[PDB]
A paper describes a structure:
Quinol-dependent nitric oxide reductases (qNORs) are membrane-integrated, iron-containing enzymes of the denitrification pathway, which catalyze the reduction of nitric oxide (NO) to the major ozone destroying gas nitrous oxide (N2O). NORs catalyze the reduction of two molecules of nitric oxide (NO) to nitrous oxide (N2O), using two protons and two electrons to cleave the N─O bond and concurrent N─N bond formation: 2NO + 2H+ + 2e− → N2O + H2O. In contrast, qNORs are single subunit enzymes (NorZ), in which electrons are supplied by menaquinol. qNORs are found not only in denitrifying organisms but also in various pathogenic species, many of which lack the full denitrifying apparatus, bringing to attention the role of qNORs in detoxification. Cryo-EM structures unexpectedly revealed AxqNOR to be a dimer.
AxqNOR fused with apocytochrome b562 [BRIL (30)], AxqNOR-BRIL, yielded membrane fractions with high NO consumption rates relative to the total protein content and was chosen for structural studies. Data were processed, with C2 symmetry imposed, providing a structure with a global resolution of 3.9 Å [estimated using the gold standard Fourier shell correlation (FSC) = 0.143 criterion (32)], where local resolution valued the core of the protein calculated at 3.7 Å. Because the BRIL density was at significantly lower resolution, it was omitted during model building, leaving just the AxqNOR model. The dimeric AxqNOR is related by a twofold symmetry axis and exhibits a similar overall structure to those of other qNORs, with 14 transmembrane helices (TMHs) and an α-helical hydrophilic region. The map showed helix pitches and density for bulky side chains, consistent with the estimated resolution, with several hydrophobic interactions between TMHII of each respective molecule, where Leu240, Leu241, and Ile244 act to stabilize the interhelical interaction. The densities of heme b3, FeB, and their respective ligands (His486, His537, His538, and His629) are well defined, where additional conserved residues (Tyr638 and Gly603) provide structural support to Glu490 and His629, respectively. Previous structures of active NORs, including cNOR, have shown the heme b3 Fe to FeB distance to be between 3.2 and 3.9 Å [for NmqNOR and Pseudomonas aeruginosa cNOR (PacNOR), respectively], whereas in AxqNOR, the distance is 4.1 Å. The AxqNOR structure contains the correct nonheme metal at the binuclear center (FeB), but the density for the carboxyl group of Glu490 suggests a different conformation for the side chain compared to GsqNOR and PacNOR, with the carboxyl group approximately 3.5 Å from the His486 NE2 atom. Glu490 in AxqNOR unequivocally faces away from FeB, suggesting that Glu490 and its equivalents in (active) qNORs do not act as an FeB ligand and instead ligate a water molecule along with Glu559. A notable difference was the poor density of Glu494 side chain, which, in the wild-type AxqNOR, was resolved to be facing toward Asn600, forming a hydrogen bond.
Author numbering:
A (entry chain B), B (entry chain A): 1 to 256, 262 to 743
Amino acid sequence: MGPYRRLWFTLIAVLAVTFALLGFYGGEVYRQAPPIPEEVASADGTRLFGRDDILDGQTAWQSIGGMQLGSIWGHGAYQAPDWTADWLHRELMAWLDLAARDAHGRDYGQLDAPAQAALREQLKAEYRANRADAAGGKLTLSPRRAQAVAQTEAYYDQLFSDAPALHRSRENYAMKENTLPDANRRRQMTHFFFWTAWAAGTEREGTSVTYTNNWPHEPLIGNHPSSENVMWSIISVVVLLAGIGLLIWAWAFLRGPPAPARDPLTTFALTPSQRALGKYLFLVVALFGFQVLLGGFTAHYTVEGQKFYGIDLSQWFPYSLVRTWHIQSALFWIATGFLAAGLFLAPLINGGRDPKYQKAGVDILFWALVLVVVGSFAGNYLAIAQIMPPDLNFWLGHQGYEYVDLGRLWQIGKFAGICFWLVLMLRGIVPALRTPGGDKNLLALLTASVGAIGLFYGAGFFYGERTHLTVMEYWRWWIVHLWVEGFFEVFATTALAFIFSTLGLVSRRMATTASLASASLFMLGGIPGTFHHLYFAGTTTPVMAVGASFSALEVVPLIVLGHEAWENWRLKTRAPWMENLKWPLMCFVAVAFWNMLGAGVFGFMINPPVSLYYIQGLNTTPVHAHAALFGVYGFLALGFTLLVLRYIRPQYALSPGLMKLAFWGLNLGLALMIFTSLLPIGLIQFHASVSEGMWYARSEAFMQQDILKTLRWGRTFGDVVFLLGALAMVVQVILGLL
Amino acid sequence: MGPYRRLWFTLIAVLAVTFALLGFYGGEVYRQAPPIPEEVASADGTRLFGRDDILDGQTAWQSIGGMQLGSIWGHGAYQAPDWTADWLHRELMAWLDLAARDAHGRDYGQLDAPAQAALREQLKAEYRANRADAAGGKLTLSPRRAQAVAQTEAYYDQLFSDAPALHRSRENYAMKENTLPDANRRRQMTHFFFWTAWAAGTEREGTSVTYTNNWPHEPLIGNHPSSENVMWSIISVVVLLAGIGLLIWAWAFLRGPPAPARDPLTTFALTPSQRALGKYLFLVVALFGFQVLLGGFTAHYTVEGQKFYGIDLSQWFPYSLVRTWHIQSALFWIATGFLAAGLFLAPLINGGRDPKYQKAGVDILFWALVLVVVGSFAGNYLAIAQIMPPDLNFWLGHQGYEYVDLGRLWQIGKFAGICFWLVLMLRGIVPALRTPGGDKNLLALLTASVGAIGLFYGAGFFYGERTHLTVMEYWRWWIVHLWVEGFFEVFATTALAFIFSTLGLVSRRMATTASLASASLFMLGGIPGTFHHLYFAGTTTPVMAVGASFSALEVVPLIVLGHEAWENWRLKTRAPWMENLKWPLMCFVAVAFWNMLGAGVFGFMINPPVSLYYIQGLNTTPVHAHAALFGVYGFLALGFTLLVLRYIRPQYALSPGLMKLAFWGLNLGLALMIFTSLLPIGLIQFHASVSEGMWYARSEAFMQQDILKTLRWGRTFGDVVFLLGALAMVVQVILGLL
Ligand code: HEM
Ligand code: HEM
Ligand code: HEM
Ligand code: HEM
Ligand SMILES: [Ca+2]
Ligand SMILES: [Ca+2]
Ligand SMILES: [Fe+3]
Ligand SMILES: [Fe+3]
């Protein structure tokens, strides 16, 4: 309570109206989803696959890499072409030849211009029709379409089967040699690729958009952005520029501490529990050196084929296996960065004593946390090699969906570990607010943050092996755009301000009101901002209305970062003994520079739904993904490491001269391979994706254009700058642990 | 010179690099203009009109209102449809009917869908070809196109002719009854319309865009935006956001006065010259009341036809006359407000004495201005009614182009009056900085601003009666986007800081650096920002490449207006005698609010070239025009009126209770007639313009859709608030002049 009745009500007011908006629209994503047809038949009488064969074909797609091989409805990896827009153009060109063979005498390519436009108008009448029969379950597609589907089916049966004809196209797609040894799996898998491009073509009931909201930009069947799609883009621009101006207008009008001579953390000297965190500062730097070194190993498969300078490590370590470890070990060391600074802050609040069985609680968390890492990395190896039986795949092995690629049995092992980290926080915080005090204001906010950071991983359930892919793309982003983006940015603002409150630099009054205006602004457009990962995947038009207007308000408090980047840096002059923490106070400054240039600048370039239409599935998304994940949550795990290196080894200097290469190799290393080798490839692809089609921007005839070859062979001029910038950090921490 | 060596070098550096970028591209706008063909002939052998007939048709179009009747290439008025898209659609449907009449047996409307798409591909083949013969001067268009042009000539001959059949379509376009009594004048005007929509269809040499950069969005002949258009749009967006964030960053990191007891302006008491400004302060409010009444009179012709509750004032006072007066008297009173403020500031700088024959120039300049006003209005009335002979039209009468609609002789009169104001400034300012002092830092900037504001009306020359329309649209925006937008915003910052410096509130050190940091920022994207009025008018793609990217940087220093709207309002508390200037210190705050909400927010909504494509010529442009013209330079001539009411009548109070109404009527009326009756009309026109075509968003089958009728019949509820606010302000000024 206290005098904070205004602030503590407007945070619950945001978390009540902007939290039912994932629930009032969460039923809209379910019952407006593209249905899987019960029976696919031809008009002559034969019966093709049904809804059982599609779902078993989905499990065949998961066993080869899932979204880490080639993207489906845009989301995935960006080397192999998306199989819902590469199946589409190969099916329409098969139809255009089977409708020209009995038209004059020739094919679609050898007709003059006025007569070849009399066939693309017949494509719009058949392929933008023949939807479901209103719970009759039948499809009954045309017999000229039954021959074109079976014609292109033999091309995808020959691509995943070790055939000698399609070499040097399995080399530009970074598929190993087989990718599916069994024969009935890839006969069932390419039935699933039909349904993922059946829904991309058929019209919804009465409207002028498709089931996937007109996504794969194809000039044959008239796939152009909607009328309501362009009108909801210009509304999304005026929300931003009238939000930035009205924030600085209300900031400049509605406004209106001697430091101690000793550091108050060295007066405690707690030996038994906080000395056991030396392992956790090793697991951060061991996974960080392993995660960069995979990056130079998965970017090598982009440039070359599968050679690796002599013998090929391609039948053991293919592209979709080294990419799966590159994302998954990245989310671990960001997670165990906060887990070190979380458990360090547990016994420091309740005086300087530990709870009962605290060191016994820490020493069994770490050996269960390392059980998951080397336990999930075996499941990826025994599933992409296709050794494990396919019925037991989802539980241990490989899930298929990116950012949740650890198996279901191992996924409980990550959820049980953070839930065990939850009770080790609450046993050390309930003797601090259940005591009769009157200053439990920051402690009540931090209690709500630790309760939310460990229970929002549980939304990674509610989807199993065989549920509908629109349901698998709704609960998946609840832990990527709400647990990594949202609630890692609440816990890293309070616990950041809790340290500056304890050292005696902020006066605990402007450390709480600054942590409820910077905890409700990030949540105003953060919980209903989940929906900008669900534009073109089985949704209606109001889903891009909630996710393009209420998503610009998480770009409003990110551009204005002059404050909270100077008043976290001018704390250096407030004490003579703030030279010992100079380098953590330089990492919490370069968090702010990449929270406006990775989340604000490069994050709004792809936000409005006319410019996510042409960009979704290109090389402009890993510009935003590399910069907003290492820049914002990747310098916090290195700011909470070189701070926790102090107070547990308070005798070793940080050795400047090494840190000036360990800090200025991460910044300039990240801003040189983005602005030379990932951004200009993302604009040659954008110039082709809006001119010709979506299939043209990922086709292998385009990605070997002799200008996109010299623009990814120049990744290595920035890769080795990042490499030595990462080695100089881990050599410091290993030297610091002695 | 002095300690200001950095700023006074970077301002000349900006005005040196961003000023050759107008000349080196003005050469490109000249030598890449769409040529007028020397001879138009048919393929059978006959000879149609030539280029002289096209130029006489241009003069005939000028004689009836010019751009105030119906827009040409988007620029103009927004009631009658743009003739270069309406002519285009009528000519294309005439060609489709003449090519279907000899195809099977029917027309384009009564053909099935696959066979009517075999004629639009022939429209794409014939109409996107047959350009000029490489300076051969001939056209030699197809005889079917000759028959289609001769067929659609008769409708536009019948529309401007008093013909009975075409009533109640001459009433929804607000044309009086005749608009052209002579017959050869409209017979040549139709040929001019043929030229201005011939340039909208033909392909440039080798490229894939037209001469007017693919402008009139027509799905028949494939008029869709380019790829480089969309690429420069996304580049413009990232330039804006990366500008705002870096400006706030470098503001927050790179930083580092007793008031007197008496007002220092009442200590001078200069009686002979400054008492002669009552005529100017009466002329400002007289033209302001007359202009608001003309605005209320010209919006009635939108809602009703030409009735005016009984007898019609339509053959004497048509829509074109009242619209021309509504723009021109607005520009006149906005100019003479600054003129009176500068002439007040003239003798105060050189101590408290006047130059020789100072009262005589003031006493003749007022009668010269009022002579120019009544002669221009008499010329408009005697030119639109078609009484004055067509040989003598451009000199006195009506020019045709909007914002320069006063005739050439009256234009020389206005330029001579502003030059007389210039020499009256320089005869009073040169004995103040030629004295041996060391404080001529602000006065040099003010002298350069006076030399800028008084000379660049002279770029309204260099185009006469018969030059090419791309040349007439290059020198026209040199006095609308560089003399009104740019150099009225330099003269209003230095004079404001000079007044706040002379009064003894700022310390003259932060009044100079803040008047070059806020004079070099507005000029970085202001002089090469002219080019966003020249996207789709006879230009190439480098012109929009300059005018998007280098124009987003004049939106960057406008959103951040928390500073320069609080440090100009917190000057009120610095003295007890700053209650006498309370209302100018609210006008100079409403200037900042509408400068961020009419130039930033609603001004960037229409800026990027993919969203100016569908918007150019709609009801979203008068939103930005009414907001940024009365909001920024309209409260400035009401701040410099109620400040100059002090120090010449320093005995009459401002009478609060009336000033609250005269402020919060203007603000609430301008913010309520924009957000109710001009913004959703603009959004409905945007939706229909991006769905169907450009002809559909201005057609009279669409602008009576029964929802656009109730959305402009609610203009009056915002009109009467603005009306009563204007009446309260003028009755206050008339009561104060006694
Ligand atoms: C020198 C440093 C790095 C290199 C060479 C590298 C390599 C790569 C490459 C080539 C991709 C593109 C994969 C594809 O095309 O499908 C990628 C994706 C990704 N990287 Fe890195 N990486 C580096 C640093 C990092 C770091 C430090 C992190 C996080 C802690 C990270 C997180 C990610 C993520 C999340 C993706 C997935 C993007 C997406 O699929 O949309 N990267 N990495
Ligand atoms: C602040 C921390 C942020 C993080 C950690 C983050 C992380 C990510 C990642 C890793 C992806 C790639 C997902 C994938 O490959 O499937 C992504 C995509 C995306 N992000 Fe962010 N992001 C952040 C901020 C933002 C912001 C502020 C916006 C504002 C509009 C935004 C808009 C988007 C959009 C539209 C996509 C979809 C791009 C696509 O699917 O191709 N992000 N985000
Ligand atoms: C109650 C107040 C006003 C009313 C009813 C009014 C009426 C109108 C109307 C209906 C238009 C649209 C003409 C068309 O559609 O072609 C217009 C245009 C315009 N008005 Fe006003 N007006 C008002 C106030 C003002 C003021 C105070 C200014 C001060 C400078 C102003 C400047 C302009 C300009 C420059 C245009 C031309 C916009 C363009 O052609 O793009 N108006 N006025
Ligand atoms: C600050 C003072 C400003 C003033 C006095 C002003 C005035 C005007 C006026 C009167 C028009 C209408 C021209 C016509 O009807 O032909 C116009 C158009 C336009 N303005 Fe502004 N403007 C200002 C700021 C801005 C800014 C900051 C931008 C930034 C991008 C901008 C972008 C545009 C564009 C693109 C158009 C063309 C719209 C069209 O032709 O339909 N304006 N301006
Ligand atoms: Ca991805
Ligand atoms: Ca206009
Ligand atoms: Fe997101
Ligand atoms: Fe402009």
